[PDB]
Amino acid sequence: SSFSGKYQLQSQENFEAFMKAIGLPEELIQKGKDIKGVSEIVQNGKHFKFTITAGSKVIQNEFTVGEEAEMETMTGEKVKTVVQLEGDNKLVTTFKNIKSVTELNGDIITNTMTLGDIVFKRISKRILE
């Protein structure tokens, strides 16, 4: 129903392999790979505000689903794309050669980013306030 919440990272797979494939420096990969931080989502209808803790970087993006928006990526690049809401619990987008799926089931968000044969998966649990 609503994506709003603070989410603490529980586990992830292929962080290092994904970040190397997009060109992050090895120095930032090593600094960030063990951080299990908190990301925040605020949903207002079709409007989303994301404050994402990704490794050692915090990225703050905002978009309305179905509308073209400029979003900052891990590399600092701003890509123009459209995120769609599938059902009430799946956010889907593609940018560059990455497919991204954000799925909410109960209190668990699973984010799956696919690049070639690397599936980068993050599992985060809502903080029950």
Place this chain on the structure above:
Amino acid sequence: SSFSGKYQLQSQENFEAFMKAIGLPEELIQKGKDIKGVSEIVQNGKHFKFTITAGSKVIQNEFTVGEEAEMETMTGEKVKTVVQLEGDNKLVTTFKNIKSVTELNGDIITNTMTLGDIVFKRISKRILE
């Protein structure tokens, strides 16, 4: 008694002036000045683990009060200093020409950094899980 918990930034004063004075790149100042993230402290006696969201950076430091510690600063430089306990609810340290005071008051933390005539003040609030 215990600093442990997750804290969300509520307000801060003089972020830009302080970050300029320590020499942070202007591009990082502009993107970080409006981020209100979550920091986590894990305390075990005199031993502290900090996962700090500061602007657009995540900084992870560890240390024991009264022991010499090597800590990463906002610029990525590593400094050696000693963190002291003042009372039971204040951590104090000096490094370079900065004095940092971290004060716990129930569910509120006030971090005050003084650099010459600039007082960079952050007020955060415990996330109640």
